[PDB]
Amino acid sequence: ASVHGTTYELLRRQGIDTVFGNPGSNELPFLKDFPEDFRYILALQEACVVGIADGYAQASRKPAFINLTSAAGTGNAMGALSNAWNSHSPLIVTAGQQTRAMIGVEALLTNVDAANLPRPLVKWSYEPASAAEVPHAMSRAIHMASMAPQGPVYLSVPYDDWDKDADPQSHHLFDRHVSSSVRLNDQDLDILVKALNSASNPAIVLGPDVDAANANADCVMLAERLKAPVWVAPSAPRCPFPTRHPCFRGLMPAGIAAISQLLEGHDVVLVIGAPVFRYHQYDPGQYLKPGTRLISVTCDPLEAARAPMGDAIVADIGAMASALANLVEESSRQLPTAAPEPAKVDQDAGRLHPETVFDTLNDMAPENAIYLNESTSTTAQMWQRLNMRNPGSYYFCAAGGLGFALPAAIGVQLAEPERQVIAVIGDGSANYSISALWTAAQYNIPTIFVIMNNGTYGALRWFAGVLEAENVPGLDVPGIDFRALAKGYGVQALKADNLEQLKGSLQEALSAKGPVLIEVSTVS
Amino acid sequence: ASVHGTTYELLRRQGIDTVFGNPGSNELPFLKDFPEDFRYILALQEACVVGIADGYAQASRKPAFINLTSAAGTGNAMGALSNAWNSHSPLIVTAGQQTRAMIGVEALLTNVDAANLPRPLVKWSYEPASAAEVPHAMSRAIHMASMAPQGPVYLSVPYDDWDKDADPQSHHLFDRHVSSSVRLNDQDLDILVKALNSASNPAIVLGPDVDAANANADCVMLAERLKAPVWVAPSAPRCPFPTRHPCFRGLMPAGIAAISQLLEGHDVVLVIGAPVFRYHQYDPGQYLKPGTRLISVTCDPLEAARAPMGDAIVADIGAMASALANLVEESSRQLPTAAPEPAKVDQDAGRLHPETVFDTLNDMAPENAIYLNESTSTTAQMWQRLNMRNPGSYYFCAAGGLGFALPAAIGVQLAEPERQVIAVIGDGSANYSISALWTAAQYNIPTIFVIMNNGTYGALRWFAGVLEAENVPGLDVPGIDFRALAKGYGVQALKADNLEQLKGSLQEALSAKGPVLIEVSTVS
Amino acid sequence: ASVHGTTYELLRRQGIDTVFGNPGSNELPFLKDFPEDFRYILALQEACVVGIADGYAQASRKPAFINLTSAAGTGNAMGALSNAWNSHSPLIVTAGQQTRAMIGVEALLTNVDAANLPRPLVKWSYEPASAAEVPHAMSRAIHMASMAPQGPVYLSVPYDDWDKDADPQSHHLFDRHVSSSVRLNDQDLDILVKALNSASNPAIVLGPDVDAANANADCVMLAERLKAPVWVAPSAPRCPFPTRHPCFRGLMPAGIAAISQLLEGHDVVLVIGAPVFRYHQYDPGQYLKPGTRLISVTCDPLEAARAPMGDAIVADIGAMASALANLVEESSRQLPTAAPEPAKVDQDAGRLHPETVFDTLNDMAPENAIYLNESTSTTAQMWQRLNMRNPGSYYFCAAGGLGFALPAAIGVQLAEPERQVIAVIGDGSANYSISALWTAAQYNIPTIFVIMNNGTYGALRWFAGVLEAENVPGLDVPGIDFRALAKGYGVQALKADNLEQLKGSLQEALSAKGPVLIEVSTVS
Numbered sequence A, B, C: 001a002s003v004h005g006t007t008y009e010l011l012r013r014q015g016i017d018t019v020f021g022n023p024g025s026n027e028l029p030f031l032k033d034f035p036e037d038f039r040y041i042l043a044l045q046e047a048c049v050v051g052i053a054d055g056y057a058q059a060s061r062k063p064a065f066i067n068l069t070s071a072a073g074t075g076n077a078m079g080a081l082s083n084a085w086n087s088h089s090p091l092i093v094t095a096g097q098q099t100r101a102m103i104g105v106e107a108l109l110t111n112v113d114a115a116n117l118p119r120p121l122v123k124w125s126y127e128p129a130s131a132a133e134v135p136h137a138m139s140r141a142i143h144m145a146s147m148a149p150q151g152p153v154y155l156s157v158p159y160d161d162w163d164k165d166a167d168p169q170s171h172h173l174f175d176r177h178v179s180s181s182v183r184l185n186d187q188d189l190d191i192l193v194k195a196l197n198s199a200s201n202p203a204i205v206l207g208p209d210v211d212a213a214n215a216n217a218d219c220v221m222l223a224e225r226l227k228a229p230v231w232v233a234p235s236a237p238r239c240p241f242p243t244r245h246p247c248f249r250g251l252m253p254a255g256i257a258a259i260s261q262l263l264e265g266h267d268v269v270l271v272i273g274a275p276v277f278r279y280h281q282y283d284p285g286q287y288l289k290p291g292t293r294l295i296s297v298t299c300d301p302l303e304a305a306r307a308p309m310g311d312a313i314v315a316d317i318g319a320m321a322s323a324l325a326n327l328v329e330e331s332s333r334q335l336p337t338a339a340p341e342p343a344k345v346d347q348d349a350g351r352l353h354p355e356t357v358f359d360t361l362n363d364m365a366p367e368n369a370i371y372l373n374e375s376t377s378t379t380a381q382m383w384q385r386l387n388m389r390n391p392g393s394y395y396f397c398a399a400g401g402l403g404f405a406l407p408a409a410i411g412v413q414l415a416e417p418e419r420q421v422i423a424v425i426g427d428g429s430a431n432y433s434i435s436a437l438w439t440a441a442q443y444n445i446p447t448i449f450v451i452m453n454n455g456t457y458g459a460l461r462w463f464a465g466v467l468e469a470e471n472v473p474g475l476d477v478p479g480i481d482f483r484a485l486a487k488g489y490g491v492q493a494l495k496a497d498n499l500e501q502l503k504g505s506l507q508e509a510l511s512a513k514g515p516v517l518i519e520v521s522t523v524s
C-alpha cells in the first residue's frame, strides 16, 4: 500500500473522519483521492481552521484533525494554538512540507526548521526522516494528542512522501489502544478520602478539565456528599458545574489576594481539573491564609509542578472524580444555600446594558443551549445570569487569545447538531476571525452569533483607568457594520438597538434554519 | 529616568516615530503617556498589524516598529513573520509579557518560553533579565533588524519593567550608528570585474534585495555596460529593474530545468540580491548546463551557503552594485533588443480575463503607481503586462504566505503618499487579512484594492494539474460579497462585471479621496 | 557515485584533509574505505576531539573537520563548542545518526531532535531530509563555518545515507568559492579615516579576530602611524599585537569601571576584532567617560548589536585592518610613555611563584614559542611577563570553559610543527581533558605541558574574596600525581619543586623529541 492509503486507514481505524483545513500546494498529494468516508471542512484563514477544529474537539471530547500548508499556514494558526495549549485540546495539526529533493535549497514554501515553528505551543512536534515512517509518525501524533494531559501536536510531511510505498508492518498501528485513564493507588486514595471525610469546612474548586472529562455529574455528587461550596477556577475556559445548583458559588476572580480571601476559613480546599491558579490581574497578597490546606487533582504534571502551594495528585480527571464521588461519606452538614437570583438592572429605552442582554438570552434560549464568550468586559455578568444546567455549555479562550469564539462556535455547533450554539462576542473580538462566518454559511451550520457593539475595547479601558494609565492610543474601534460583514460572508443578519428589537431578533434567530448574526448596540 | 522614557528617547533618536499595533493588557504600561511626536496605527488583527508594518518598512527602506500582546498576539502574526523573513524586512516586534511577579505561576497571558515562540522566523529573539536592561535590549533589536541581511526580530518585555528606573548609562545607546555598508576588497573586486569584462555572453539575474537597496539604477547601468539580458529571480517578492528596458527578459519560471535551459549558452551569469534560486514547482534537471558559470552577490550568508552552484560574495547590495556598475567596461556587443509587447487577449462582453485587467491597469494607472500582487494564478501575466519604470513598484508575499498584500498595500501607501498604490488580490487571498480594510478607512489611507473574483482557489486547481491530483476538496470559495465586506469596514466599494464597468470603476477609484475596493468578475 | 565518495571529494576539493574524531557505530559507514589522502586523528573523549580540532583550526586559520557519534558524543563535546563559539573557530562537526528506518522508534543511539542538541552554540545545525541531500548539506556546513563571523556548525547524518546514490548534480558543489572578505564603502571609509587623522589622542583596542585574520602586522602599522597606545580587549582568547612593542599597553582588566578609567582622556577609541567588551567581574560604573567616542570594527553582527556604546562597522577584520593601516596619515605625536618593567618577585628555594615561572619561561623559551594559558589565577602576570613578538603566539579558552588548553595545545602543535608549543595549565584545569595527552603520545606531537600545581582552584578562591564569600566547599584538589597521569597516557614526565629544578626541566623538555609534561610545585 502507499503511505497515502495506509495513513487514511490509520486515521479511520483511530476514529477520525473529519479534516479541518485550508489547502495549499504541499497538501495536494495528501488531499487527492479524498476518501468517501471522510468529510473536509474548509475555512478561509488558518486561525479559523484551528478555531473550528478546536471547538469541535472540545465539544466532542475526541481528537480533531487539521491540515494546513507550510510555515505561513502554520504561522497564521499559532495564536489559535496558544488557546488550544491552555485548554488541553486534542488537536492533530499536519502541515504540508516541500518535496524532499528541494528542502535543502529552501524552495518557496519550504517550512524551514519545521518542528521548531509551533514550539512551545505543542506537546510534540516532528518531521519524519523518510516517507515510510509517515504512518508511524501519524500514530505518534494521534496518541500524543489524546493522552492526558491532552493537547495539540504538529507533524510536518514532505509532499512527495504520500505516493511512496508504506512499510508493510504499519498495519500494527491501526488498532493500537492507548490508555491514560488512571487514578491514585488504593492506599493513598484512602488517605485522601479520610482527609475529605474529616474536613470540618471543605470547599471545592473546579477547572476546565472537569468538563473535558465529562466529570461534571461526579463532581455534583461529590459536592452534595461533602455538602461543600463549589467555585469555578479563574479565567475559566469551560463550565464544569451546573450554575444554578445550590452548591455553586460562581467564577472566582483572577487575583491572588481575592482568592485566598474567598477561601479563608475553609480547612481543606480540593481543586480538580484546574491549574493553581490561572490568575490574571496582579493582586498581591497571600496565596492561602493560615488554616487552609489545598489539595490539587490535575491531569497535567506542568500544572502540579508550578502550583505555589498545596499537595497535588497527577491522574485522569474522569477516573479520579468518579472514585472520589463514590468513596466519600455523606456528610451531616447542611447543604449550602443556593446563590440569590441576580438583580434586574435599570434599562431605559436606549442602548442595551450587558446585564439586560444576558437576562434576555437566559429567558429565551433553550435549556440545552451552548454559550461561547468573547465579550471580554462582561464575563462576570455572563456567569451570574446564564443558567447552564448541562455539561459542555460554555467556552472561553483559554489563553485569553481573541479570535477563538467565533470559529469555535461553528465547530461546537457541528459537533452538537441538536444543541443551539449562541456565541456572545464583542465588536473588537469579532474581527480577529471574521472570515469564519463563511464556513457557517457554506455548510449550513446554524450557529447564532450575538455581537455586543459598544465601539471600544472595553476590557482594556478598564485595565487602563485602573492603572491610572492616561493617553493610551488604539482603544477605540468605531465604524464597523457587522450586518454588512455578515452579508459579506452569506450569513443572515439582524440588528437590535433596544430591548424590543433584541427580543424580536432573538425570536427570529432561534426560529432560523441556518446561521444568524445579531448586532446588538450596547452601552459604553 | 524611567525605562518608559528612556526607551521612547532611544526610539526617536534611532529614527522611529510610528508604532503599528493591536493593544493588550501587557502593553498598557508601554502605551500610556504615548509621546506626542509618535503616531500609533491600530489594526484589528495581528497578521494585519505586521503586514501593514512590513509594507511600510519595505517601501520606506527603514525599520518599522510593532507592538503586540503576549503569545496569542505574537502567534496571530507568525504567518506574516514568515513572509517578512523571506523578504529581509527590518521589523522590530515587541510583545508585552506578564508582570515578573506572575511569570512563574503562568498567570493568564504569560508568554511561556517567549523567545522560542517566533523562532525560527526571526534573526534574534530575546527577553531581558531585568527592567534596567530593557533599553539595551531594544537597542540590540533595532540594530539586529537593520544590519544586513535585514529581517524581523522579537523582544518580549514584562509589563512592570516600564515604570522602573533605567540605567543612567543607557544614554550611550541613543546615537549609536551601526554600518554594514561593505563591499568586496579591491583586489578581489578587480578580479570579478575582469571576469565580467571577459564574458562573451553574460546574463544578469536580479532579486528583491536590489530593490530594497535602491540599487535598481546601478543595475540598469551595469546591464547597459555589459550589454546583458536581465531576468528577475523566481518567486520575486519585489521588482528590481524597469520592466520595459530593452535588456529586460522577465520573471524566471520557478523551476530547476526551466532556469538552466533559460541560461544555456550564457558563459557567465551574475546574480545580484537573490537566493539561488527560489524554485517552487519541482522541475528536475540540471542546476546549470555545461559552459555556464554562476557568480552570486548576496547580503545573506545563509543564501550564499545553500546555493547548490556557483561562487558567492557576501556583501551589501547597494555598495556592490554601485561599485560594479562604475568599474565594468562598456562592452562592444550590441545592446539587447526589447522584448515584444504582449499579445492582446480577446475579450467579449462578459467576465474579465486577467490579461484584460492588467492591460487596462497599465493603460490607466499613473506611471509611478505601486502594485501589490496576491492574485496567485495570474502572476506571470501581471509581470508581462505592467510597465513598472521606477524602484519600489511591486510587492508579492516573499514566503508565499497569503494575507500579506492587503495589509501591506496600506503600509506602502502610508510610506509613499504621492504614489498611487494598487493591490491586485484574488478572492481567495483577500480573506486572510480582510480586517486590514478598517485601518485604511480609519486613517484615510487611499489604497486601491482590486479583487479578482473567479470563485475558486485558481492556482491550486492548476498545481493540481502538474501533480495530476483528482477529487481534491476545498478548492472552491463561492458566495463571498466583497462590496459588503468593504462596506462592513467603511471602505467605498465598486463592482466591475465587464470591461466597460472596469474602466468606469478604475476611473472613479483613481481619483477618489479615500480607499476604494473594486470587485472584478474574472474568468474561470 | 555514492554519497560517501561524493562527500569525500567535496571535502578534498574544499581543502579538508584531516578528520578529528572519536568513532561510533553510526559513523562506520562514513569512516569505511577511509581515503588515502586523508588522515584521522583519534582522541579518547569528545571534548578532547573538539579541543584538538579547535587548536588546529585557530592556528592554521582554516576550517577543521570533526566526526563524533550521535547524542552522547555530541553532548560530551558541548563545553568545547562553547569555547569555539566565542573564538569564532570554523569547526565542521558531523555526528552519526541512526539508520532512517529506526529513527522513529528511537532505537539506541538515535539522536532525538538532533539539530536542537548543540543549539545555541553553533551558527548552523541541520539533519538532511534525504541521503541525496547529504553532499549539499555538507557544502552548506563548510561555507557556514567559513564565512565571517566564523564559527562551529553541526550536521547530523543517518548512517544508511552514505551508501546511497548522490545527486548527479552534486558536482556543482565541489569548487564553489564563497567570499566574505569585505570592507566599508569608500565614502564612509574616508569619513572614518578623517576621524582617525583628526583625533588629538586616539587609542586602539584589539581583540582575537585580529590574530585570526593575521592582521597583526597591519595593526602595528596603524598604531605606529597614529602613535596610539594599544590595549588587548579583556578576557583575550588570542594575542593580536607584539607585547613588547612601544605602543603596547597590556591586557585590559575585564571590568566596566576599570576600562572606562583606562580609556579616559582619549577622544577617539578604535576597537578592532573584539566584542565591546568581554567583561567578567562585576565592576559597575561608566561604560565610557564623557569626551570619548568609540568606533568598533567587528566581523560579527551579534557583537555590533550588543555593544552598549559607540558606533560599529561590520566587516572583515583583515580587509579593514589593511585598508586603515594604508590610508591613515603619519602623526608627528610622541609614542606612548614606555611601560614599567615587571618586578622580580623574591623567590626562596621552595615552591615557585607564578611570576618566577613566567620570568624563566620568557628567558628560556624560543622567540617564536606559542603559549596556551589555562592557569586561571595567573593570567595577568602571564601577560605582563611573556614577550610574544609574533602572530598566533597565545591561546586561552574564549568562553572561559576549562578543558580547552591541553587538547588545543596538541592541535596547535600539529598545525605549527616548527614552532614550540608550551601550554601553561593549572592543576585543576588539567583534569577536564586529561586523556588528550594520549593523542600527543600516539601521533608524537611534541607539545610541552607545564602544570602549575598549587593544589587548589586558585581563581575561585580569589573571586570569592571580592565577594567576601565564606565557607565555600569544593575549592581544593589535593592528591593528584601528574607524572603518573602522564605515564598512564605514554608521555614523558618531569617534576620541578624549585627554581633550579625548573630550569633543568625546561632545558630537558626543550631538547626532547616527543611531548613532555612538567609538574611544577607553585605557591598557594
Ligand SMILES: Cc1ncc(C[n+]2csc(CCOP(=O)(O)OP(=O)(O)O)c2C)c(N)n1
Binding pocket: A079, A374, A375, A376, A377, A378, A400, A401, A402, A403, A425, A426, A427, A428, A429, A430, A432, A454, A456, A457, A458, A459, A460, B022, B023, B024, B025, B069, B072, B073, B076
Ligand atoms: C489576539 C489578541 N489580541 C489582543 C488582545 C487584547 N485584548 C483583550 S480584551 C480586548 C478587548 C476586546 O474588545 P471586545 O471584543 O469588543 O470586548 P469588550 O472588552 O468591549 O467587552 C483586547 C484587544 C488579546 N487578548 N488577544
Ligand SMILES: Cc1ncc(C[n+]2csc(CCOP(=O)(O)OP(=O)(O)O)c2C)c(N)n1
Binding pocket: A022, A023, A024, A025, A046, A069, A072, A073, A076, B079, B374, B375, B376, B377, B378, B400, B401, B402, B403, B425, B426, B427, B428, B429, B430, B432, B454, B456, B457, B458, B459, B460
Ligand atoms: C496562509 C496561506 N494559506 C494557504 C495557501 C495556499 N494557496 C496558494 S495559492 C492559493 C489560492 C489563492 O487563490 P486566489 O487568491 O483567489 O487567487 P487565484 O489562484 O485564483 O488566482 C492558496 C489557497 C498559502 N499559500 N498561504
Ligand SMILES: Cc1ncc(C[n+]2csc(CCOP(=O)(O)OP(=O)(O)O)c2C)c(N)n1
Binding pocket: C079, C374, C375, C376, C377, C378, C400, C401, C402, C403, C425, C426, C427, C428, C429, C430, C432, C454, C456, C457, C458, C459, C460
Ligand atoms: C568547564 C568549567 N568548569 C569549572 C569552571 C570554573 N573555574 C574557573 S577557574 C577555576 C579554577 C582553575 O583551577 P587551576 O586550573 O588549578 O588554576 P588556578 O586558578 O589555581 O590558577 C574553575 C574551577 C570553568 N571555568 N569551566
Ligand SMILES: [Ca+2]
Binding pocket: A426, A427, A428, A452, A453, A454, A455, A456, A457, A458
Ligand atoms: Ca467592545
Ligand SMILES: [Ca+2]
Binding pocket: B426, B427, B428, B452, B453, B454, B455, B456, B457, B458
Ligand atoms: Ca480566485
Ligand SMILES: [Ca+2]
Binding pocket: C426, C427, C428, C452, C453, C454, C455, C456, C457, C458
Ligand atoms: Ca591550581
Ligand SMILES: [Mg+2]
Binding pocket: A116, A117, A118, A119, A120, B116, B117, B118, B119, B120
Ligand atoms: Mg517557535
Ligand SMILES: [Mg+2]
Binding pocket: B420, B446, B509, B510, B511, B512
Ligand atoms: Mg489617487
